[PDB]
Ligand binder design. Sequence first.
Ligand SMILES: CC[C@@H](C(=O)OC)[C@@H]1N=C(c2ccc(Cl)cc2)c2cc(OC)ccc2-n2c(C)nnc21
Length: 108
Amino acid sequence: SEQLKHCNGILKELLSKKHAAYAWPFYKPVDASALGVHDYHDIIKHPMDLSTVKRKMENRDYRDAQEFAADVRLMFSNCYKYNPPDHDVVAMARKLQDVFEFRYAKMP
Ligand SMILES: CC[C@@H](C(=O)OC)[C@@H]1N=C(c2ccc(Cl)cc2)c2cc(OC)ccc2-n2c(C)nnc21
């Protein structure tokens, strides 16, 4: 699909070395305990990350571009939900989200 093809194109860019300085926290699912937090899944009922998005895209589980956008945004939303507005990871999330939001808008 031309939209989903566009989305796959966005996913690839989000995973580029190009944005690796602020994207790396979003490459894989949050491992709370490992990071020293034990309340993350109390707060966050629906974890999401880029590898899972890439998985679903490979299984063609996305009915359209909107479902894709919803997951990517959920990933960012989870990060802003759990963390304080001044946290570094949050700043990393806004930088990557600006790449996503800008490419998503340029879709046919
Ligand atoms: C687990 C909650 C939060 C935290 O306090 O981590 C110690 C965490 N911080 C971080 C975090 C904290 C500070 C910086 Cl500068 C970057 C990432 C984090 C780190 C990772 O390493 C593989 C993966 C995920 C996160 N992450 C995401 C995404 N959303 N919130 C976080």
